[PDB]
């Protein structure tokens, strides 16, 4: 790896610089290098990893959706044939997106998940595993769309089981996991009732636990709760 010669601390420092500069591809490469040093990630480092790859794949997903929409219109009645280019370029972006997802899933499998014993880290990494299988599922069509969907579900489910046993209902990682698993149900698994039920139950149990928190803990938490409510309002 091209980051093999750089100190772990320097990789973390540069990931933070890359974040400040909104250079998320660089950020992701620095954080991959840090993971490959073989040591566990701290809480802050896990956030750097997630932010970097979420932003890289987020841009790829946005571009893929633009191109897929153009492609679908090109295949409607009365559309002029313009050749293979739209498909080719959509495929190019898709393959790049799949590559980034595969890279993240490989880091999680080698060896972040197996060394993660504390609930915070284990739920965090399993949520990411669900997220990146979900992104693979968004572009999947062939003989493994179903296996990819079940891989996402399995990871989200294991994270959910741990989060409910080991984390308070207002924990931001537990909340964000529930938010994203609810979106998986709505958008991937064709299970809108499960999506709504999960978002509602999560919101209500978090509300009832807010009284235990300091003013700052009452923050990204109430923040993610608003996202649950936003989704519920979109869906009902």
């Amino acid at each position: 790896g091209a980051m093999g010669s750089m100190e772990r601390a320097s990789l973390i420092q540069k990931a933070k610089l890359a974040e400040q500069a909104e250079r998320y591809e660089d950020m992701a490469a620095f954080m991959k290098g840090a993971v490959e040093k073989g040591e566990e990630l701290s809480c802050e480092e896990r956030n750097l990893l997630s932010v970097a790859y979420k932003n890289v794949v987020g841009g790829q997903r946005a571009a893929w959706r633009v191109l897929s929409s153009i492609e679908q219109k090109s295949n409607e009645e009365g559309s002029e044939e313009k050749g293979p280019e739209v498909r080719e370029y959509r495929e190019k972006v898709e393959t790049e997106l799949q590559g980034v997802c595969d890279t993240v899933l490989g880091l999680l499998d080698s060896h972040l998940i197996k060394e993660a014993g504390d609930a915070e880290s284990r739920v965090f990494y399993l949520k990411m595993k669900g997220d990146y299988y979900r992104y693979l599922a968004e572009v999947a069509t062939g003989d493994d769309k179903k296996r990819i969907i079940d891989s996402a579900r399995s990871a989200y489910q294991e994270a959910m089981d741990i989060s409910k046993k080991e984390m308070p209902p207002t924990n931001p990682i537990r909340l964000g996991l529930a938010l994203n698993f609810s979106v998986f149900h709505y958008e991937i698994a064709n299970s809108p009732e499960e999506a709504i039920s999960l978002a509602k139950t999560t919101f209500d149990e978090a509300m009832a636990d807010l009284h235990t928190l300091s003013e700052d803990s009452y923050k990204d938490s109430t923040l993610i709760m608003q996202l649950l409510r936003d989704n519920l309002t979109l869906w009902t």
């Binding site: 938010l179 994203n180 979106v183 958008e187 936003d230 989704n231």
Partner: peptide, 5 residues
Amino acid sequence: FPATV
């Protein structure tokens, strides 16, 4: 699209 974090 719905919100994810």
